[PDB]
Design a protein around this nucleic acid. Sequence first.
DNA 1: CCTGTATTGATGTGG
DNA 2: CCACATCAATACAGG
Length: 131
Amino acid sequence: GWSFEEQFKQVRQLYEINDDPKRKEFLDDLFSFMQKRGTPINRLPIMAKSVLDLYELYNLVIARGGLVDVINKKLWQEIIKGLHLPSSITSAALTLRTQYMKYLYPYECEKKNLSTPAELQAAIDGNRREG
DNA sequence: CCTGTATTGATGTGG
DNA sequence: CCACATCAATACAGG
């Protein structure tokens, strides 16, 4: 179920997306950095039957100054559309928020420290239905 | 032919 | 009305 080759085709799909050297350092560093976090990506989140650009998602997330700002202000529409995702996924923002929390929360919080888990968790409760 | 894991999409709530 | 959240079906691989 977890084979390095299976992941190779998955990340290879991430580098083929385009010839952006800066993007390579991200994917390369992210898989490396995640090793330190202890949360390695055995499967990249997929969107529209395609791998999610962990790099473009990041730049948009940092562009708002912290994942929490996006939740409280809901700037996911800009992220969701910024990536040109198909309206076929109604849980796009949630897919982006849920997954960003697990995989990119360290790179965004550890390298930039834009916010804290309580702010993010509190923002999550603020958007999650009370019941 | 079956079973397990990961990912995508429908409908409803609140201002 | 839209964006978001919860729950369920499908595709691929081993035998």
